[PDB]
Amino acid sequence: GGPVTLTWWDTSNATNEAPTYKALVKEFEAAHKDIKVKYVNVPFDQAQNKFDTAAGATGAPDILRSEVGWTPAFAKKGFFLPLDGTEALKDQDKFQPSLIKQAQYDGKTYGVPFVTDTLALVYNKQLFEKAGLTEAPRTWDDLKKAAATIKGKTGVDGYWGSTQAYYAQSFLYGDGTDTVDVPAKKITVNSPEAKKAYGTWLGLFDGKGLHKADTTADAYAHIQDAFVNGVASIVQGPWEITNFYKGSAFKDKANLGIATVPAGTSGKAGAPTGGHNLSVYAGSDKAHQEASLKFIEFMTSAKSQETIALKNSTLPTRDDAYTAEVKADPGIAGYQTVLAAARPRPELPEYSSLWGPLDTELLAIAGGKESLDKGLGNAETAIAKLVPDYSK
Ligand SMILES: OC[C@H]1O[C@H](O[C@H]2[C@H](O)[C@@H](O)[C@@H](O)O[C@@H]2CO)[C@H](O)[C@@H](O)[C@@H]1O
C-alpha cells in the first residue's frame, strides 16, 4: 500500500509548453506525498485517436489535456468522469462562464478550463514599417494588396496562409457563415457563402507577395520556420508566442505585431475559439479518480495559471489570474484585444470531427489535385456520415 500512480497524457507543445507543466507536476508531488504523477507527452495530431483507442480497452491515462472540442465528444462517448460537485470545481465562480459552457455536455461539466485561445493575424512590424504600412489590413482584399506592396519594397513574401480547416474557418466567419447550421440542422460547406469564403482563401495563395500552398503533412512547421526567421505575416494563435521569440526576426519582442484576423463580406471579422480542458478518465478506479480531482484543483489554481501565463504566454481562463505581470506581457495584452473577435463553438459534439474530412479535402483543393466544387462536394458527403441529422 504505497502512493497512487497517476498518468497525465499532455498534448501541449513539447519544446515551449511541456517544460512549464513538468515543473508544476513536481510542485504537486512535493506538497502531496501520497500521489505520484507520470508525465507523458502525446503529439496533438495523434492524441484524439490514441485516447479513443485506449479509453475503451486498457492502457488509458487517468488525466488528459483534452481539447475544448474533444471534451463534449469524449463526454458523449462516456470516457470522461463528470466533475459536478467535486473538489476540482471548488472555484467554479472564478473561471470564465463561457469556457465552462464549452466543457459542459447535456447540462453536466466533464472538464476544467485549463487554457484558452483564438487565431490572430500576427505580423512583423519592421517589414510593415519598411514597406510604408502603419496598421494591419482590415479585410482579406487589403491583405492581398498589402502583400504585393511588402514584396515590391522588401522582397519578402507578405503572407503564407495555412491549408488546415481550423485556420480556413476564419474565412467562413468573415463572410457571415459557418461549417454547419445547428438550429436549422444543415451542412453549409458547399453553400453560396462557403464557396466564396473558400474562394477567397484559395485566392490568397496565388499573387505577388503571397506564398503558394504547401501539400506536405508538416506544412505547419515550415510556416513557423519562415515567420520566426523572417514571411511578413501569418494567422496563428498564442501558443507559438514563445516559439516566435526564439527566432532571429523577433529578438525584439516589440517587433511582434498582433492584430485581429481580417474581415470578409460580412463586415466584421471572426476567428475560432480554442483551448484545452483537463478531464479525468471514468474507467479508472475510485482511488485514482479522487487523487486526479486534487491534481486538477492544483493545476487550475490562481497561482498555477498566473505562472503558466508568464512562462508560456498562453491566456489564463481565471479572471483573478490576470495580474499586472500577466497584463504587462506584450503577447497576452495583444491577444486579449483580438479575443473580442473569437467566435464560440456551438453545442454539437461532432463539430471538431467535421474538420477531419475538410483537412483532407482542402489540402487537395489548395494542392491543385481537385477543383473547388469537387472537394467541397466530397466534404459535404463525408460530413453527412459523421452527422446525418442535416441534410446538405
Ligand atoms: O490545430 C487546431 C488546434 O490549434 C491549437 O492547438 C495547439 C495547442 O495550443 C497545443 O496543444 C499545441 O501544443 O499544439 C496544438 C496544435 O494545433 C488550439 O489550442 C486548438 O484548440 C485547435 O484545435
Percent of residues in helical segments? 40-55%
How would a crystallographer describe the biggest sheet? 7 strands, mixed
* SS-based class: alpha+beta
Question: What is the number of domains?
Answer: 2
Total number of helices: 16
Choose one word for the global shape: globular
N-to-C SSE series?
A: EHEHEHHEEEEHHHEEHHEHEEHHEHHEHH
Distance between the termini: 58 Å
How many strand elements? 14
How much strand?
A: 15-25%
Q: In angstroms, what is the radius of gyration?
A: 21 Å
The unique ligands bound to this protein are: a molecule of 2 linked components (GLC-GLC)
GO molecular function: maltose binding
InterPro entries: SBP (IPR006059), SBP_1_CS (IPR006061)
Family: Belongs to the bacterial solute-binding protein 1 family.
Keywords: Signal, Transport
Structure write-up:
The protein has 392 residues and is of the alpha+beta class. The protein has two domains: 1-118 and 272-346, no CATH class; 119-271 and 347-392, no CATH class. It is 43% helix and 16% strand. It has 16 helices and 14 strands. The protein has helices spanning 18-31, 44-56, 70-76, 97-103, 125-130, 140-153, 165-174, 192-203, 219-229, 241-246, 286-299, 302-312, 324-328, 330-338, 355-367, 372-386; strands at 4-10, 35-41, 63-67, 104-105, 108-109, 112-118, 120-124, 180-181, 186-187, 233-236, 256-259, 271-280, 315-316, 342-343. Strands 1, 2, 3, 6, 12, 13 and 14 form a seven-stranded mixed beta sheet that branches. The chain has a three-stranded antiparallel beta sheet with strand order 10-7-11. Helix 7 crosses helix 8 and helix 15 packs antiparallel against helix 16. The chain is globular. It starts with a strand and ends in a 6-residue tail after the last helix. A molecule of 2 linked components (GLC-GLC) is lined by residues 11-13, 17, 44, 67-68, 117, 166, 237, 239, 274-275. It is classed as protein binding. Keywords: ABC Transporter, maltose binding protein, protein binding. It forms a monomeric assembly. ABC transporter binding protein MalE from Streptomyces scabiei in complex with maltose. The protein is Putative secreted maltose-binding protein.
